[PDB]
């Protein structure tokens, strides 16, 4: 008769999930009354986000989808495709990419997607988009592989006018070949065309998440832009072509190793660094503990230090299977917990601002992953072998 | 219509040509009474928080021959405005009053008359220094307040005063001493509530035996209310007043009780039909005038808005006042009037 | 040599035609001048309309589109793909569906379409939409079954950015699967994805208007919303999870047989109700006559009744062939007349509010397709027999 989708479609389908979160965050408080003739310029706040997700093992009951998405969850809730209501939990997550790990809670009779070499694919490349565009439910659309980056941002026309970027690209065989995401942070939502992550990449970023807790990208803790801001002008910036360093992060390498706001990067091992972007990007291809010498420009200063992991990429209330912002630590030097905040269900712990966790409870807890699978295996007593850089105590 | 708007200027310009007739038995109201008004408001962004701003708004008459022109400035001021604080403006301007009983000025003609223009702080009037905090300090959404200083208006120059004389002086039914007011409004949702205090120094030209209600000061106490949602508009207001409203060419009134209301609704399809009623009772007037009404009248009218640019109107004035020695003297309109508007407005 | 669809596109194109309508409306009067920095809140007005069709019988002529096309038209025209111009008149609408029925005057010619079975309809499956998106003409775009409902609207991504809502929506074999519709009423204009009405309740939808004058849907005569709206809130309603009852309709089964604003329904037949939309979309399930009992709250109230034809779907100036607001009663009794208007045209031939007409100028006129049926045939003499109830008058 006449061809169709249809048939691959129904094979790939039960890998397709829908995600539904609920969780709250910090809004300003609101001041009244209000006057929409005046251009002006803390409480949490449920909201409700929804969006598509990959079952990608389908044993271990793991869903990739969008960072926009989960983060920020409480409650994270999965439906598979022929009905089935299921619970998830945060595995990993990592804002860059905007990719996220979940894991369904109580996997039964799960189907998975392969997924096929991201490398293989060539512009003229058929493709197909799997996604919930305005939550009414689960939309396919198709098309072709517009551009191949060559990070890989995956590029194509099977996207959604004015609509959520969904989650799944896959090629004609059915095979995963990249997560749809939203280029339009703390929006999604699309630019006019679509931009995936490639398949392979996914795989890759998604395992650091299981066997470490968190993806492993040291990051050289400087913040800045471009020399066109407000402030290169305000404060006039002498030869203008890099990276304006607007400030160096706390407890950071670039600042424990040596830098301060003005300078403006030129070069990064000898390779030249024409804008926060190319350096953005080019400290993004270094997994932590690495070592980086670049020059900087005041008058002409320049030096050599090793980063530390990221701080995007962490974690919060599914380290300890039970409920309450740590992240890894160097190599497999334990797992360092970062800002307690201020309800202090951890702090409470006698848990301070930075003290690593090594003792699995009694063992050893090289990571994230690890420490998590021994909250999980015995629930009964847990004694949190804690130490703080010299303070090693022991709580419940 | 914004016709300038680059580097932090905008320029609005604005204006309207309203055809209109009046019938009445009253002659002296009665015929063409078309008129256009022009006016610009502009605003330059000085800093993120600071922004300055001017505006002029001009009336001139469209019902005259070629041998004259009637026409006059309403409004002329420049200010400064800076985010979540205030703001401070110059010129001629509306008193702090007219925060208030603005609200009742919503007729399709007529209303508005309990009081007049250059009547102290009431309406717009010459040399306003005029303090403004909206939302106390943005930490109270809804809540306004303005206090206001007036310059003295004297007598004219040149014309062989030996005192009382100001630079831009006029006729002592239009002068002013100096003057203070204020006004506080609070709008939640639909409703609003308001008060507003003046009080102003009066002129010897003032207080001559020529004029009723002599007096040290001219004083007014405002108080009014507003609804205005869910295409439903009504709002009342209260005045007391002593030395401060007029009564015709005669003067002023000792003490005068204005009361305004005003019922609108807005159908879907455009039509917006308007009832209300104004009265201004005078107390101990002199002369052997004792108590009199000075206006009292119900107000019935509609606008069809065809656009957000052209309406026409009409608005029935069923005058309620009688005609009398007292309304004859002081040369007070006891007539009805038919008003027919025809509106195009940019 | 290369693929293409103009082989099946030359197969189909006579059968879809363009149509221009002339009509008019009542606007409210402007008030002027025009103030643009003022926000501020009776006469006809003639305005233009243009969209596609899809004829569907080509004896008759018959011609299926939008209602958002022809609603309040005077004057329709059609345009065959081959040029022929012809002129065509009302036989049907149906704002629920956004689907009409019109009827060229004078066939000659013609070709239609083979309407496909909707009910096979598969998600992978190719798609064609035909439609004349900016005036310009008729564009033909293509795609695939994006989802499939399941009222079971079919979503396809063969739609046109910032377009107007189209009509046909064809398979590769040429045929009817869908007619594209507007799902932004008072407006035509896509949310970003197509949404069509599939072609059996396209072919059900149509033969009513044929065999009956209008469509056999029931209304509960109740208006009103969610829980949310400003009057469940000014109106602080106990117990939030059903259809608000703003107001109960004039001469309705619901105001006959008994209910009042306020209540919230909670379920209709046992079946719970948690939304208006879940309720208007249950009670158009159900043809006139039907009865179905429902539960509402007030402290603990409840009830059941019969639903009569639903007012949205009715006719005018096309009943008699001549010019002039009628619709059906319950069963075959009859045609029953409702809201007359100012002009009074036929409320002037003494014809009342709730005026019936049996009596087909002479004979049985159980519905508007007989009694059109008549006036069509014998344009000679007309006494059109009503009866408003009691009286049994005759005039012409």
Same mark, same amino acid.
């Given at each position: 008769?006449?061809?169709?989708?249809?048939?691959?479609?129904?094979?790939?389908?039960?890998?397709?999930?829908?995600?539904?979160?609920?969780?709250?965050?910090?809004?300003?408080?609101?001041?009244?009354?209000?006057?929409?003739?005046?251009?002006?310029?803390?409480?949490?706040?449920?909201?409700?986000?929804?969006?598509?997700?990959?079952?990608?093992?389908?044993?271990?009951?793991?869903?990739?989808?969008?960072?926009?998405?989960?983060?920020?969850?409480?409650?994270?809730?999965?439906?598979?495709?022929?009905?089935?209501?299921?619970?998830?939990?945060?595995?990993?997550?990592?804002?860059?990419?905007?990719?996220?790990?979940?894991?369904?809670?109580?996997?039964?009779?799960?189907?998975?997607?392969?997924?096929?070499?991201?490398?293989?694919?060539?512009?003229?490349?058929?493709?197909?988009?799997?996604?919930?565009?305005?939550?009414?439910?689960?939309?396919?659309?198709?098309?072709?592989?517009?551009? #191949?980056?060559?990070?890989?941002?995956?590029?194509?026309?099977?996207?959604?006018?004015?609509?959520?970027?969904?989650?799944?690209?896959?090629?004609?065989?059915?095979? #995963?070949?990249?997560?749809?995401?939203?280029?339009?942070?703390?929006?999604?939502?699309?630019?006019?065309?679509?931009?995936?992550?490639?398949?392979?990449?996914?795989?890759?970023?998604?395992?650091?998440?299981?066997?470490?807790?968190?993806?492993?990208?040291?990051?050289?803790?400087?913040?800045?832009?471009?020399?066109?801001?407000?402030?290169?002008?305000?404060?006039?910036?002498?030869?203008?072509?890099?990276?304006?360093?607007?400030?160096?992060?706390?407890?950071?390498?670039?600042?424990?190793?040596?830098?301060?706001?003005?300078?403006?990067?030129?070069? #990064?091992?000898?390779?030249?660094?024409?804008?926060?972007?190319?350096?953005?990007?080019?400290?993004?291809?270094?997994?932590?503990?690495?070592?980086?010498?670049?020059?900087?420009?005041?008058?002409?200063?320049?030096?050599?230090?090793?980063?530390? #992991?990221?701080?995007?990429?962490?974690?919060?209330?599914?380290?300890?299977?039970?409920?309450?912002?740590?992240?890894?630590?160097?190599?497999?030097?334990?797992?360092?917990?970062?800002?307690?905040?201020?309800?202090?269900?951890?702090?409470?712990?006698?848990?301070?601002?930075?003290?690593?966790?090594?003792?699995?409870?009694?063992?050893?807890?090289?990571?994230?992953?690890?420490?998590?699978?021994?909250?999980?295996?015995?629930?009964?007593?847990?004694?949190?072998?804690?130490?703080?850089?010299?303070?090693?105590?022991?709580?419940? | 219509?914004?016709?300038? *708007?680059?580097?932090? *200027?905008?320029?609005?310009?604005?204006?309207?040509?309203?055809?209109?007739?009046?019938?009445?038995?009253?002659?002296?109201?009665?015929?063409?009474?078309?008129?256009?008004?022009?006016?610009?408001?502009?605003?330059?962004?000085?800093?993120?928080?600071?922004?300055?701003?001017?505006?002029?708004?001009?009336?001139?008459?469209?019902?005259?021959?070629?041998?004259?022109?009637?026409?006059?400035?309403?409004?002329?001021?420049?200010?400064?405005?800076?985010?979540?604080?205030?703001?401070?403006?110059?010129?001629?301007?509306?008193?702090?009053?007219?925060?208030?009983?603005?609200?009742?000025?919503?007729?399709?003609?007529?209303?508005?008359?309990?009081?007049?223009? /250059?009547?102290?702080?009431?309406?717009?009037?010459?040399?306003?220094?005029?303090?403004?905090?909206?939302?106390?300090?943005?930490?109270?959404?809804?809540?306004?307040?303005? =206090?206001?200083?007036?310059?003295?208006?004297?007598?004219?120059?040149?014309? $062989?005063?030996?005192?009382? =004389?100001?630079?831009?002086?006029?006729?002592?039914?239009?002068?002013?001493?100096?003057?203070? $007011?204020?006004?506080?409004?609070?709008?939640?949702?639909?409703?609003?509530?308001?008060?507003?205090?003046?009080?102003?120094?009066?002129?010897?030209?003032? @207080?001559?035996?020529?004029?009723?209600?002599?007096?040290?000061?001219?004083?007014?106490?405002?108080?009014?209310?507003?609804?205005?949602?869910?295409?439903?508009?009504?709002?009342?207001?209260?005045?007391?007043?002593?030395?401060?409203?007029?009564? $015709?060419?005669?003067?002023?009134?000792?003490?005068?009780?204005?009361?305004?209301?005003?019922?609108?609704?807005?159908? /879907?399809?455009?039509?917006?039909?308007?009832?209300?009623?104004?009265?201004?009772?005078?107390?101990?007037?002199?002369?052997?005038?004792?108590?009199?009404?000075?206006?009292?009248?119900?107000?019935?009218?509609?606008?069809?808005?065809?656009?957000?640019?052209?309406?026409?109107?009409? /608005?029935?004035?069923?005058?309620?006042? /009688?005609?009398?020695?007292?309304?004859?003297?002081?040369?007070?309109?006891?007539? @009805?009037?038919?008003?027919?508007?025809?509106?195009?407005?940019?």
């Amino acid at each position: 008769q006449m061809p169709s989708l249809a048939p691959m479609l129904e094979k790939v389908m039960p890998s397709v999930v829908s995600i539904n979160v609920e969780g709250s965050t910090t809004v300003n408080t609101p001041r009244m009354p209000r006057n929409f003739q005046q251009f002006f310029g803390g409480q949490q706040q449920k909201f409700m986000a929804l969006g598509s997700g990959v079952i990608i093992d389908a044993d271990k009951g793991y869903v990739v989808t969008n960072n926009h998405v989960v983060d920020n969850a409480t409650v994270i809730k999965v439906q598979l495709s022929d009905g089935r209501k299921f619970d998830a939990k945060m595995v990993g997550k990592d804002p860059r990419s905007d990719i996220a790990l979940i894991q369904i809670q109580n996997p039964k009779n799960l189907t998975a997607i392969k997924m096929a070499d991201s490398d293989a694919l060539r512009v003229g490349d058929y493709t197909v988009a799997i996604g919930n565009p305005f939550g009414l439910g689960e939309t396919v659309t198709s098309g072709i592989v517009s551009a #191949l980056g060559r990070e890989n941002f995956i590029q194509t026309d099977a996207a959604i006018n004015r609509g959520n970027s969904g989650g799944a690209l896959v090629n004609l065989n059915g095979e #995963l070949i990249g997560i749809n995401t939203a280029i339009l942070a703390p929006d999604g939502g699309n630019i006019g065309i679509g931009f995936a992550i490639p398949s392979n990449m996914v795989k890759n970023l998604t395992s650091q998440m299981v066997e470490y807790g968190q993806v492993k990208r040291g990051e050289l803790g400087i913040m800045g832009t471009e020399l066109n801001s407000e402030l290169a002008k305000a404060m006039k910036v002498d030869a203008q072509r890099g990276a304006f360093v607007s400030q160096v992060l706390p407890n950071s390498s670039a600042a424990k190793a040596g830098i301060k706001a003005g300078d403006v990067i030129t070069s #990064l091992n000898g390779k030249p660094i024409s804008s926060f972007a190319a350096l953005r990007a080019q400290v993004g291809t270094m997994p932590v503990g690495s070592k980086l010498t670049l020059g900087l420009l005041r008058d002409g200063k320049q030096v050599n230090v090793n980063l530390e #992991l990221q701080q995007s990429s962490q974690n919060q209330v599914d380290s300890s299977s039970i409920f309450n912002e740590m992240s890894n630590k160097g190599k497999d030097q334990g797992v360092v917990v970062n800002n307690v905040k201020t309800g202090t269900p951890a702090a409470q712990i006698g848990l301070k601002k930075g003290d690593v966790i090594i003792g699995a409870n009694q063992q050893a807890v090289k990571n994230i992953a690890e420490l998590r699978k021994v909250l999980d295996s015995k629930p009964s007593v847990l004694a949190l072998n804690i130490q703080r850089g010299d303070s090693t105590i022991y709580l419940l | 219509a914004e016709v300038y *708007n680059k580097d932090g *200027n905008k320029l609005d310009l604005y204006g309207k040509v309203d055809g209109l007739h009046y019938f009445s038995d009253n002659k002296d109201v009665d015929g063409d009474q078309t008129y256009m008004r022009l006016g610009f408001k502009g605003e330059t962004q000085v800093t993120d928080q600071l922004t300055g701003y001017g505006q002029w708004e001009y009336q001139i008459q469209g019902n005259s021959a070629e041998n004259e022109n009637n026409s006059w400035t309403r409004v002329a001021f420049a200010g400064l405005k800076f985010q979540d604080v205030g703001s401070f403006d110059y010129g001629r301007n509306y008193g702090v009053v007219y925060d208030v009983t603005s609200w009742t000025d919503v007729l399709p003609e007529f209303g508005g008359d309990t009081y007049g223009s /250059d009547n102290f702080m009431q309406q717009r009037g010459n040399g306003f220094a005029t303090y403004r905090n909206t939302d106390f300090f943005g930490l109270v959404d809804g809540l306004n307040f303005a =206090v206001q200083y007036q310059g003295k208006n004297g007598n004219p120059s040149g014309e $062989g005063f030996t005192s009382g =004389v100001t630079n831009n002086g006029r006729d002592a039914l239009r002068q002013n001493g100096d003057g203070v $007011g204020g006004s506080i409004t609070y709008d939640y949702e639909g409703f609003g509530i308001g008060g507003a205090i003046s009080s102003s120094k009066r002129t010897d030209a003032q @207080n001559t035996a020529a004029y009723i209600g002599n007096g040290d000061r001219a004083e007014t106490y405002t108080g009014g209310l507003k609804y205005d949602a869910n295409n439903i508009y009504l709002a009342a207001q209260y005045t007391q007043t002593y030395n401060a409203t007029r009564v $015709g060419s005669l003067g002023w009134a000792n003490k005068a009780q204005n009361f305004e209301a005003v019922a609108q609704y807005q159908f /879907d399809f455009g039509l917006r039909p308007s009832l209300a009623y104004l009265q201004s009772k005078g107390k101990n007037l002199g002369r052997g005038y004792d108590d009199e009404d000075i206006l009292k009248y119900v107000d019935v009218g509609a606008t069809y808005y065809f656009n957000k640019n052209m309406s026409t109107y009409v /608005d029935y004035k069923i005058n309620l006042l /009688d005609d009398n020695q007292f309304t004859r003297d002081a040369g007070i309109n006891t007539d @009805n009037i038919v008003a027919l508007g025809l509106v195009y407005q940019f």
